[PDB]
């Protein structure tokens, strides 16, 4: 529970997702309440390999889908993400955001902050599925508008979240190198200088 307020999504996916089948606390929390957050943190750290085992094919969530179908989280979002189909993935984003994220106290505090993580997940999956593709071809395939396509990719690419190349002359999108040797060493620059800052600052304080 405390991992949801501090925006963890990593260590919370190793507990609420993979666990025993009951965890009924009665007055505090219920079974359907804890099972709802399983699809929250499970879509961040767990890759597609664990989505088809501890999420989809997990017997704990199979009984909840046939019981309460109004969640539209552990079922609609997981099937659309596993199929990598943006056509059916879009309408399940607004339905889940309204009836799940907003009412819950530990969710609506994130809300669009958690929505930004789900959208960049499907854009990264399709990015590895092709090299060069026309913008009008993808617009007519998955049913996405051209005007709203530039605004979706404009909140990520400049932040170095996803590497993509788009040629507006021919209206095509390219694929950059997802992982490179220099990109890994750039993260060690801030981590290396971040440690040396504490060693120098706290070292001079005690003297």
């Amino acid at each position: 529970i405390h991992c949801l307020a501090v925006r963890n999504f990593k260590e919370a996916a190793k507990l609420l997702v993979d666990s025993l089948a009951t965890f009924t606390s009665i007055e505090l929390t219920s079974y359907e309440s804890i099972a709802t957050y399983a699809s929250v943190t499970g879509l961040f750290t767990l890759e597609r390999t664990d989505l088809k085992s501890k999420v989809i094919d997990s017997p704990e969530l199979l009984s909840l889908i046939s019981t309460t179908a109004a969640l539209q989280s552990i079922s609609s979002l997981t099937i659309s993400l596993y199929a990598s189909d943006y056509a059916s993935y879009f309408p399940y984003l607004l339905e889940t955001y309204a009836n799940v994220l907003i009412p819950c106290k530990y969710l609506n505090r994130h809300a669009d902050f958690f929505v930004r993580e789900m959208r960049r997940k499907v854009y990264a999956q399709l990015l590895e599925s092709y090299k060069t593709l026309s913008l009008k071809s993808m617009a007519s395939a998955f049913g996405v508008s051209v005007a709203f396509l530039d605004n979706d990719l404009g909140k990520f690419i400049p932040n170095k979240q996803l590497n993509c190349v788009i040629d507006r002359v021919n209206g095509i999108v390219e694929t950059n190198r997802p992982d490179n040797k220099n990109a890994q060493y750039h993260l060690l620059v801030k981590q290396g200088d971040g440690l040396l800052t504490k060693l120098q600052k706290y070292g001079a304080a005690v003297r």
Partner: peptide
Amino acid sequence: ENWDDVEVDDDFTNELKAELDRYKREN
């Protein structure tokens, strides 16, 4: 809170529902 909680979002609210307009018309 790096590049997230400071600027929040302030987007994708009324523009998300507006996408279904062009989807159910031009098609």
